Structures are given as C-alpha cells and as structure tokens.
Amino acid sequence: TVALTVPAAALLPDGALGESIVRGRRYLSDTPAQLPDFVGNGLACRHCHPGRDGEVGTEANAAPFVGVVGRFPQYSARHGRLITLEQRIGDCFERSLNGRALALDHPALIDMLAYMSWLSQGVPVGAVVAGHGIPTLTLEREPDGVHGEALYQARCLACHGADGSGTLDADGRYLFPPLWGPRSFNTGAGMNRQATAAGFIKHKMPLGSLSDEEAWDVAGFVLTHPRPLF
C-alpha cells in the first residue's frame, strides 16, 4: 500500500480545474441542498465519508476518496461487469442517498470527480492507499439487538436520536445524521449490511472506542429498523 496524504488547499491551482475542485467539495459536503433533484434523503456524502478541515473523504477506515480514482474501472458483482467511478458514484446516489444517478457527463458529477482526483494527487494508478474503504467487522455469533438497544441509549442516542432521526443544524443540514427512518440510507446501501455497519461503527463511532462485541451488537440494533426500500 501507499500512505494516505491530504493535499494542501492553498496549493489549489487557479483556473477551471481549481474552481471545479471547490464545487466538487461542496457537492460532496452539502449534497441534499446542492443536488435536490438527485437526493432522496437527508444524507450528504460526508456523513459516511468524513474529512477534516472541510474536506470530504480523507479519513482512514471511513472510505476515503484519497486514491480512489486509480482503482477504477473495476469489477462490480452488483453489475456483473466492470464499472467506472462515475457509475460507482451513481450507485451511491441511488442507494446511500435514496435518489437518482447523475448523467455520466453531468457537470456536478465531473466536479466531484475533479475533487476526488485532487485528493488522489500523487497516488500511483493501481496502488492501494492505507486506510481505504470501510473494513468489515464480523463476529462468530448473531448480533444481540437487545444489548444493542442498551448500548444505543447509552452511547449514541444523544446525537442520533431516540427515533434515529438525527439532529438538524441551524441551516437545515444534518449535524448528526439519521440512522434509520425515511431520511436515512435505503436497503440497497452498503451501510445496510451488518458487517459494514459494524466496521464503520467500530472505527468511527461514537464520534471523538467500542469493543468488537459492542460495535457488532449496536449495529445489529440499528439495522432492525425500517428505512426506505430500494
């Protein structure tokens, strides 16, 4: 693998590419408000792909976009063939954002690509960046949703809500995003899979850690709830 490095925002180039990169960051950070025609829930890309200092997709084990461009095209079992990064992003809009894929030459999509390419500067094509993806956590037993409910109340509810519906900020964006219900990800999302949710939670939640057993059980509890159908 190669190291995860985040480029300097002050070294962004003047011109069309620099302006596209800045728009891309905003589409990834503020997706429901910037692309209402394509987003069907309350999630922005940054809610599962967090980053520091206003960037999106720069955190190890939270599916960083640093280096993603050099890993496409790649096989998708979902599609039964090779897909491009443009297509992968469309799947995210359809599933994680319960919405509609952008056209493959949509300027907003190209801006998102430009941003991911910027984050990927210096990464050799084909190389795997340390911390890529969301590593799964799988235990050798069923998740205990009763334990998970107790853990949720003690460790998660203060942010994500008794009803899992999250906490809105003053501008109507989610400060703490919804984990289930009509504004959360739909059943087709990767985050709807037990080992993925458990892995994400293990590595990233609560914000600011859980034992494997705790992450496994609270993920199980989260995933007992209704959410939009894909």
Ligand X SMILES: O=S([O-])[O-]
Contact, 173 vs 183, CB < 8 A? no
In the bound state with ligand HEC, the residue whose beta carbon lies nearer, of 14 and 169, is 169
Binding segment for ligand X (CB under 6 A), chosen from 16-24, 136-144, 154-162, 183-191, is: 183-191
99 is a contact residue toward ligand X (CB under 6 A)? no
Measure the CA–CA gap between 122 and 141, rounded to whole angstroms: 42
Beta bridge partners of 76: 81
Q: Which residues are annotated as a binding site for heme c?
A: 45, 48-49, 156, 159-160
42 is a contact residue toward ligand X (CB under 6 A)? no
- What tokens does 127 get? 């190389």
- Restricting to residues 48-107, which ones interact with ligand HEC according to CB under 6 A? 48-50, 63, 68, 71, 88-89, 92-93, 96-97
Torsion of CA 105, 109, 113, 114, to 10 degrees: 90
Contact, 157 vs 199, CB < 8 A? no
137 is a contact residue toward ligand HEC (CB under 6 A)? no
Binding segment for ligand HEC (CB under 6 A), chosen from 17-25, 120-128, 139-147, 174-182, is: 174-182
In three-state secondary structure terms, 76 is: strand
- What tokens does 210 get? 């859980």
In three-state secondary structure terms, 147 is: helix
Q: Which residues make up the interface to ligand HEC (CB under 6 A)?
A: 28, 31, 43, 45, 47-50, 63, 68, 71, 88-89, 92-93, 96-97, 112, 132-134, 155-156, 158-160, 176-179, 184-185, 189-191, 196-197, 200-201, 204-208, 218, 222
